[PDB]
Amino acid sequence: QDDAELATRAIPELTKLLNDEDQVVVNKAAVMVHQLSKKEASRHAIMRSPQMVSAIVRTMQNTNDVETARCTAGTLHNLSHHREGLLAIFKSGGIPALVKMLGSPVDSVLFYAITTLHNLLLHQEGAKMAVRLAGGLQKMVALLNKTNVKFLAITTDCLQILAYGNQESKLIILASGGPQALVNIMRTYTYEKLLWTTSRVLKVLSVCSSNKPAIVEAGGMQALGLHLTDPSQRLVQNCLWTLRNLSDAATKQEGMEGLLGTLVQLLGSDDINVVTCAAGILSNLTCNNYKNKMMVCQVGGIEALVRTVLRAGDREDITEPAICALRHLTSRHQEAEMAQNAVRLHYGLPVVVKLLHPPSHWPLIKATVGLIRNLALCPANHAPLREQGAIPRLVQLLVRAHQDTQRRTVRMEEIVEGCTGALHILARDVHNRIVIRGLNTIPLFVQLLYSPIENIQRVAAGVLCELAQDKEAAEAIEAEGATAPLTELLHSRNEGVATYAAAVLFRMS
Amino acid sequence: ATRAIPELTKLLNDEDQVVVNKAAVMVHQLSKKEASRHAIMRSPQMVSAIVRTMQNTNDVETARCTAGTLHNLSHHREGLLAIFKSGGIPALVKMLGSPVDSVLFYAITTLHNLLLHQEGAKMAVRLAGGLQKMVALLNKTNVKFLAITTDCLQILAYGNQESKLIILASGGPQALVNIMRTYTYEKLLWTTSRVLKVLSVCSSNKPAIVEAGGMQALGLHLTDPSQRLVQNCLWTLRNLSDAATKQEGMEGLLGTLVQLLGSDDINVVTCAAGILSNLTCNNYKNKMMVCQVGGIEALVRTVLRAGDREDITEPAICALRHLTSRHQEAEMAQNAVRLHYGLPVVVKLLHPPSHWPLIKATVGLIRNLALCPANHAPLREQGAIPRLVQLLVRAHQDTQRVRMEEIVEGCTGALHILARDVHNRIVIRGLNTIPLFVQLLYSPIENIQRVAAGVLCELAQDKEAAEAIEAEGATAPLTELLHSRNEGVATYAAAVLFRM
Amino acid sequence: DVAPIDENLKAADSDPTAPPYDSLLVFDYEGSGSEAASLSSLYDYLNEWGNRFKKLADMY
Amino acid sequence: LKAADSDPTAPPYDSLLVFDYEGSGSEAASLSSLDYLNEWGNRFKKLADMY
Ligand SMILES: [Cl-]
Ligand SMILES: [Cl-]
Ligand SMILES: [Cl-]
Ligand SMILES: [Cl-]
Ligand SMILES: [Cl-]
Ligand SMILES: [Cl-]
Ligand SMILES: [Cl-]
Ligand SMILES: [Cl-]
Ligand SMILES: [Zn+2]
Ligand SMILES: [Zn+2]
Known part of the structure; x- marks a missing residue:
């Protein structure tokens, strides 16, 4: 209570000193201010003086003295641990200043800067926008060439916060060669926190159509695959979400x-x-x-x-x-x-x-029908599929999908094509043919021969072809009036449909 | 006192400085008492002697005593007049260079009193070069001294462009902004904010104040408890805003x-x-x-x-x-x-x-608000269209008999954006606007031709509208606009034609 | 979806460019963006500082 | 046409309002303030007499 009181008249006094034109005075005040920022009572007096924080910020970005740059940046870092400190920094032009200090040749200054910014990015409203506008993205991506892993973890997370839900940032990161740099980190380092923060950036970028190809080209799929059995589940899951987003492009x-x-x-x-x-x-x-x-x-x-x-x-x-x-x-x-x-x-x-x-x-249903079409290629699956009831259900799906296509005003045409294609393959088996026909399917199949869609015509002709290998069936097809439409399918630019059309015609005699 | 004055006067004019010094001391002490003070100020020769002695002595004691004496006389109407008449101003200005604070303080305070009550002081200080000197004193650190110095500048600058230019030439803006970033003494911040306010209406000081970081500096005080400080910072900020x-x-x-x-x-x-x-x-x-x-x-x-x-x-x-x-x-x-x-x-x-x-500003806002599809219907439901049309017809009439030319452009541009919605088009057409829009194609103003061709372009996408555009004879002016030097005009004119 | 009498008929039943085609699923899960709040971290002398610091040196 | 509607160089344009309030010019009347003639020569004897 007596420290806070003392702090109140020390702050206004040090504010005057920081604003002095004599750098010796300035530098010396910076030191005391830094030391005071390490204690709560005095730290509070600092964050609550608009002129004090403005002086620290201005001094930091304008001094040519390394110790002053360090003491001011350190003061700001210390203030960033509190809500009011974060606000004062933001309101005092601290963001553009901190983004500038990212170019500092002094590690200690750079570390204070990236860490202070991380706290702002995490907790200060408006900080994400301010950093983007001050060119923070390009600078952070460039800093990915550093090798201190703790530094890299904070820096990659800053990029994650900035890029999340913001397409423009993602494009700039790509422009700066971010994908190659981030993939390099995943291939190289073994520090879990860095692998995790980095995988989140890649995850965020992987949803952007421009970043996907770049990440994949940089060897991202293989690099992410390197960490799939790590004991860190957050690393594994993030590598998995990223891999999935990139997968259609790899x-x-x-x-x-x-x-x-x-x-x-x-x-x-x-x-x-x-x-x-x-x-x-x-x-x-x-x-x-x-x-x-x-x-x-x-x-x-x-x-x-x-x-x-x-x-x-x-x-x-x-x-x-x-x-x-x-x-x-x-x-x-x-x-x-x-x-x-x-x-x-x-x-x-x-x-x-x-x-x-x-x-x-x-x-x-569409994927399942497709799989069944492939499974039916194996003779040993013909009977099992029938016993499971594949035919009745495929027929039912086909009838419903076809009727829907015939109404004027996943597309049902695809269901028609798929279901008929599956029945087509299943018809390779004599018993399946009996079941197929027994479902009064011949009338529908013939009607599909008139379809405007080629693929449909093909599978329609195909199943009728298989069915027609049995005389009683072939005759039933002929009675149903398949000849005429079949005859017409001989002049199709699709030799497959033409081949099947020919077959059904041939077999019908 | 009256009897001693003539004596002390001669002693002050004595070439023996040792004598002069002793004299100055008594005169100083005498100026402290009101009765004797009035005696001194009523004696022209005396004051004049005090003035000369002040700027000429090489003795700090004397300098302090003489300046202090003048300061004491400045507390009275007749004293200010006496100093003014005996040329104290030019002398007081010279004393602003003193290395001794007591002297400096006496001088600036005496000038402040003169500036405040002595009719004719301002002009005199300006000629004597007081402005540049006062500005140079802004790097001092005694806040009560800075409060008075900046107030002198406020008095000298108010409604006097010339003085504002000299303050500018002297580097006043940077020095004033520094005070705003450095001190907490409210009277000083207030007195400095008033100088800034005065300078801020000057087109030459504005850029300088902004470049010195004045916008941010003034922003540091917007939540100060002092309402006068806050409001002056706001007036100044508003004056500077167009240049930042x-x-x-x-x-x-x-x-x-x-x-x-x-x-x-x-x-x-x-x-x-x-x-x-x-x-x-x-x-x-x-x-x-x-x-x-x-x-x-x-x-x-x-x-x-x-x-x-x-x-x-x-x-x-x-x-x-x-x-x-x-x-x-x-x-x-x-x-x-x-x-x-x-x-x-x-x-x-x-x-x-x-x-x-x-109304002009509002039309422009509505125009931008209509860029958002989700605003199309609600803007319609508020009756935005018929009113925009009414303002357009009214303005267009006034151009065939803020400039209405601007209203014609704005309203038509807003309608151009609103017309992106099929239902809004119905409303726009229903107000029989197609004839007017085609006429605007003849406007000599490129921007008006642009929005006219734009809205017609939006409208022409529906059968009924296109046919109505054709029946107006739009074809002639549109084909002509195909040669427009304006890319927008030419693109829209082409689109209408095509759509028809 | 992404694309790749008896004797002749066999050529038909064995055509690779015939459906079904393999297909792609474009995923784009961005996550929630949780906070990484556990990353690891990176006055007697006043009496000898002169007149400019007297005021302070006195109070401290 | 998409370019035309995109054209950022086309109206409407942003505009400035010209303010220039100098105030009235109030007055700061509240600024804070900032017998031996014997040992002396014969020159100051007359003064010592009347005092
Ligand atoms: Cl933000
Ligand atoms: Cl890259
Ligand atoms: Cl299991
Ligand atoms: Cl002016
Ligand atoms: Cl300046
Ligand atoms: Cl102060
Ligand atoms: Cl962590
Ligand atoms: Cl006051
Ligand atoms: Zn330090
Ligand atoms: Zn004296």
Whole structure:
């Protein structure tokens, strides 16, 4: 109580001294002020004097004396621990001044500056905007060339705070070469706090369409994959969210073998967010990349994805990408046939067929239909799929989707194409054909021969083709009036549809 | 006393300085007593002797005694007259160079009394070169001394441009701003703020005061308990505001100003509004900061409270117009105005008793507010369109018989933006505006041709409207405008044609 | 979605460019931005300072 | 056309209001304030006589 009282007349007095034109006086006052800022009572008198804080700030950014620059920046850092200190700093032009001190050749000054700014960025309203306007972004990205990891942790977090929800900042960070610098940090250092603060910046940048390609080009996928089994769950989860955001743009990368293997193992995690991300990342990385498909199947990806689906239940945020990954893994690569069989061996057929029913929504249903189309390529799955009731439900989905397309005023055309395509493959089996026909499907299939969509015509012709290999069926198709529309599909620019059209015609005699 | 005066006078004029010194001492002591004091001041030869002795002695004791004597006479009407008549001013000014404080203090105080009550003192001090000397004394540190010196400058500068220029030439602005950043003595800050206020109406001192960091320096006192200090800082700030788009480190000032908008003192709100309007004029950084700290809501509340007080609403509306365009957070501001219930009152300001300057500002605000789709319907529901049209027709008529040319441009530009909404187009057309817009295509003013072609472009996207545009004969002037040197005009004219 | 009589028919059933196509899912989870509040950290002499500091030197 | 509506160089423009309040010029009337003729020569004897 007597210290605070003393502080009240010492502050106005030191304010006069800081404003003196004699640098010797200035420098000496800076020292006392710094020392006073270390004690609460006097620190309070400092933060509560607009002229005192303005003098500290001005002295700091204008002195040519290292000790003064250190003492003033240290005073400001000390004031930043309190709400009123943070406010006074902001109101006294401290932000532009602190951003300038980031260029200081003196570590101690630079450290005081970045730390004071971090406190402002965290707790002072208006500080994020002020730093962006003062060119703080470009300077912080440039400082990523430093090697003190604690310094780097604070600096990367400053960039995270500034970039979050702010597209402009993200573009500037990209402009300054931020992605390459941040990926380099992830590849190099082992300090957990820095790996974590850095992964959050990458996470924030990964949602921006311009930053994704850059991060991926800088080798970000592989670097993030290096920390997926770290004991720090916050580091792992952040690397996972980032990897998932970047994944749709990394389907052409190499050196992904380790990453893919680790993701397959993470599918067995008891952490919902770990599993969700792993499934999503894997779905995207297996899209049109036969090397990744081979890798994922090789390490037991199929069994892991099926278990993921079984454990997931009706959680579509897990099942949709898991089912999409399984679809990608059951076609167009050396081990697709083995993959189609593995789904059955690990009890995936019943759940796969189950996913065609409510509460499943259209996105999931579409992916599931696609997977079934691929699974049906394996003869050993024909009977199991039938026994599970795939045919009745696919037919039902097809009927409903078709009727919706026929109304004037996920697109249902896709459901029509998919369901008919699945029935097409399933029709390769004699017993399935009986069931198919038994559902009064022939009339609908013929009607689809008139579809304006080529892909639809193809699958319509395809299933009729398979069905027509049985005489009683072929005759039924002919009676239904398929000849005319079939005859017309011979002049299609799609030799596939033409081939099937020819076949149905041929078989009908 | 009367009897001694003639004696002491001769002793003062004695060439033997030792004698002079002794004389000066008695005269000093004598000036302390009122009875003898009046005797001294009524003797012209005596005062004149005191004046000469003061500037010529080489004895501090004598210098102090003589200056002190003059100071004592300055407390009386007849004393000031005597000093003035015996040429004390030029002598007192010279004493402002003294290395001895007692002498300096006596001199500046005597000059202050003269400046305050002696008719004719100001002109004399100016000639003697007092201004540059007083300015140079502003680096002293005794605050009571600084209080008096700056008050002398205030007296000399008030309503005297010449004196303000000399203060400027002498480096007055930087020295005055330094006082504002350095001391807490309220009388000094107040006396200094008044000099700054006086200088701030000078077009040459303004830039200098701003460059010395005056805006921020004055901002340091906006929450001082001294209301006179606060208001003088605000008047000065407002005067300087049109010349400060270059300053940085303005966050504190802007934040405080936004807060002072909530004040109960009308002078304070008025100034805050004025300062903000000018500080946001073409400065994206200040626009951003003002939005961040809650300026939109504060400015909307200001308009809501103001009623028909145009001294408050005009700069508030202008500030809002600035804030709702040309900066990253303009979208936010446009939305913010609606959120804080600003649309109704804004549209209302387009009506009587609002005068043209306010109406013009309001039309511009509405124009920017319509850039936000979410404001299209509510602006319509407030009756913005028919009133904008009425103001347009009225102004256009006055141009075929604030300049109405500006109202024609503004209203048409607002309509151009409002027309981005299909329902708003219906309303605009329903007021039979197409004929007028086509006529504007003939305006000699490029900007008017632009918004005319713009709104017609928006309207031409609907069948009925296009056909109506054609039936007006728009084709002729539009094809012509295809050659316009103005890119906007030519682009819009082409679009209308195409759409038709 | 992202794209890649008997004998001739076999060429049809074995065409790679036929649906279903593999597809991408564009995720863009930015997180919540929690605070990193646990990062690690980075007057007798007045009597000998002269007249300018007398006032202070006295009170302290 | 998108460029035209984008054109930041086109109106409306921001504008300044010219203030120049010098005040009235009040007065600071409250600023704070800032027998031996014997030992003396024969020159100051007359004074010592009348005093
Ligand atoms: Cl901010
Ligand atoms: Cl980069
Ligand atoms: Cl399990
Ligand atoms: Cl003037
Ligand atoms: Cl100056
Ligand atoms: Cl003071
Ligand atoms: Cl931490
Ligand atoms: Cl006063
Ligand atoms: Zn220090
Ligand atoms: Zn004396």
